Design a protein around this ligand. Sequence first.
Ligand SMILES: C=C(C)[C@H]1CN[C@H](C(=O)O)[C@H]1CC(=O)O
Ligand SMILES: C=C(C)[C@H]1CN[C@H](C(=O)O)[C@H]1CC(=O)O
Ligand SMILES: [Cl-]
Ligand SMILES: [Cl-]
Ligand SMILES: [Cl-]
Ligand SMILES: [Cl-]
Ligand SMILES: [Zn+2]
Ligand SMILES: [Zn+2]
Ligand SMILES: [Zn+2]
Ligand SMILES: [Zn+2]
Ligand SMILES: [Zn+2]
Ligand SMILES: [Zn+2]
Ligand SMILES: [Zn+2]
Ligand SMILES: [Zn+2]
Ligand SMILES: [Zn+2]
Ligand SMILES: [Zn+2]
Lengths: 252, 253
Amino acid sequence: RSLIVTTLLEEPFVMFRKSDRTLYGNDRFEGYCIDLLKELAHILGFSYEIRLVEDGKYGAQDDKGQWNGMVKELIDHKADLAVAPLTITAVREKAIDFSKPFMTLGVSILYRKGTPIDSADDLAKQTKIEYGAVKDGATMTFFKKSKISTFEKMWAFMSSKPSALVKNNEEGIQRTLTADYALLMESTTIEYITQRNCNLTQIGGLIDSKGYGIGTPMGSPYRDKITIAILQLQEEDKLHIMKEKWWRGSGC
Amino acid sequence: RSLIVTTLLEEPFVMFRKSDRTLYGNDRFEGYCIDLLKELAHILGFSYEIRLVEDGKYGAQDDKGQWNGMVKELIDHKADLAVAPLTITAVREKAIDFSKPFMTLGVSILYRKGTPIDSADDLAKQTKIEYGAVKDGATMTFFKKSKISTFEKMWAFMSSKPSALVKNNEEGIQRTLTADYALLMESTTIEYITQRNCNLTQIGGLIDSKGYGIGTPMGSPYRDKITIAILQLQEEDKLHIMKEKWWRGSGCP
Ligand SMILES: C=C(C)[C@H]1CN[C@H](C(=O)O)[C@H]1CC(=O)O
Ligand SMILES: C=C(C)[C@H]1CN[C@H](C(=O)O)[C@H]1CC(=O)O
Ligand SMILES: [Cl-]
Ligand SMILES: [Cl-]
Ligand SMILES: [Cl-]
Ligand SMILES: [Cl-]
Ligand SMILES: [Zn+2]
Ligand SMILES: [Zn+2]
Ligand SMILES: [Zn+2]
Ligand SMILES: [Zn+2]
Ligand SMILES: [Zn+2]
Ligand SMILES: [Zn+2]
Ligand SMILES: [Zn+2]
Ligand SMILES: [Zn+2]
Ligand SMILES: [Zn+2]
Ligand SMILES: [Zn+2]
C-alpha cells in the first residue's frame, strides 16, 4: 500500500518547486531525491505520500540515547522510507536499516578562492581562519568520536568555540561568504555550491569515505528490494545522469 | 559454532603464506581479505574455518538461472561467509545478502604504456588491438548489458572473438604482456599490477562505480553485524591503512 516517506528540504536533493499556482501533496517537491523516489516507486510498484519531518533534523542522539529527526521517525515506525542526503554511519546503521548507497561522498572543506589553505593540516596548524561544521550532523559526530590526531585538534577547536558550529548549510555557506571561515562540508554539496557561487572553492580532497543511503525501519521488507533497485540504477548509469541533471549550474 | 568462510586465491586479497613449517587450517592464508576477516572475527567474536572454493569461480548464472562458485556456496548454505573481492552486483544481490562495500572501485583498462590510447573511445575506434575481460565476471556483464554507444561497440567486439575473453585475471595479465591485448580490469587490481610490472599502465579513469562486499546467505544474521563493523572500520581509517599495507610494491617511476 501507500508508504509514508519522511524527508526534509536540502538543495538539490529535496526542494519546494517554484510555481505560480499553489502546490499540494507530492507535487510540492522536486530534486534529486524526488526523482530517485519516482524511479523506485515505479520499479518496485508502490505508491507513497511525502511528509516533511517536523523538527527538520536528519537524526542525532541526545543524552538519554534517544534519536530525533528522520531516524526517530523510522525507529518509531511512523515512516516507511527516508529519502534525503542521509549519511550512512555505523551508529545510525545500528538503529535503522540503510539501503546500499545511491551516492558516494566524503568530508571536505569549503572556502573562498585565493587562500593559502591547501589541506586539512593547514587549517589545524593555525587559528586566524575559523572552521566548523553543522552541529549534531554526521560531519560533527565524525570529528567528536574521531581518534586521528589531526581531526581531534579540529574537534578541540570546534568544541572550544561554540560559534564554530553552524545551524545548517545555509548559515555555513553565508558565513563562508561573509567571514574568514571555512566550512567542513560533505563533498557532494561542495560540487553543487561551487558551480553556482563562483567565489567559493573546494580545499583539498576527501578526508573520509561515506555514502548516502535510504533509511528504512529495522527489519523493513523494502530495504533489500530498494538496494537491488539502486544497484540496477547504478549499472545502467541512471544515477550518473540523475546527478548531472541536478548539479550543473550556470558555470564559472 | 565456527562459521565456514569460502574464498579463493587472488593477490593481494587471499594468498598462500610462505613458511618453513607445513601450515594447517587458517594459518595457510594471508592477504587483505584475511586481515579483514581477522578484524571481523575480533569485533564480532566468532571463530571460522577458511575453505577455498572448489570450482575456483566467484559466482555467475547460466541460462537456467543456476549459480556456481562462492555465490552457490552461500545459496546452498554450504558456507556462512564469502570473503573475497566479490563485486556487488544487482543480479548477485538478488541471490545472496551483501554487506556494505569495504572497498570502492570501477572498471578501467590495463595496457602497455607506449600507446596513444587515452580513453575507451580509442579502443572502440579500432580493431587491430584486441581487448576483452575475464569470462563470466562482473566486468564482462557490465559491457554485455550496457546501452552507452562506446560500451556497446566494445561488447560486440568481445562477442565476435570468444578468445578475447580470458579465464582469469592471470591469463588476462599474461596475454597483455605477451600480445597486443588490453584487458578490461577492475581498478584495484590495476593499481596492484602497475606498481610491479613497469610496462603496464592504467588508461583513462573509472568507467563505472562498484564495490567489493562480503557475501552471506540470504537472511543471514551476520550481514548487518559485518556491515556495522565495516562502517566502524571505515570511520577509523582502518581499511585505508589495510589497503596501503598490501598495495605498495616498488613504485614504478
Ligand atoms: C545538511 C545536513 C545537516 C546533513 C546532510 N548530510 C549530513 C547527515 O546526513 O547527517 C549533514 C551534513 C554534514 O554533517 O556534513
Ligand atoms: C578476479 C576476478 C575474476 C573477479 C574479482 N571481482 C570480479 C567479480 O566479482 O566478478 C572479477 C573481476 C572482473 O570481473 O573483472
Ligand atoms: Cl526549497
Ligand atoms: Cl546493506
Ligand atoms: Cl564562541
Ligand atoms: Cl598465492
Ligand atoms: Zn506510473
Ligand atoms: Zn513497521
Ligand atoms: Zn555516464
Ligand atoms: Zn556526463
Ligand atoms: Zn583487531
Ligand atoms: Zn580490539
Ligand atoms: Zn540451511
Ligand atoms: Zn545457513
Ligand atoms: Zn583514509
Ligand atoms: Zn593515508
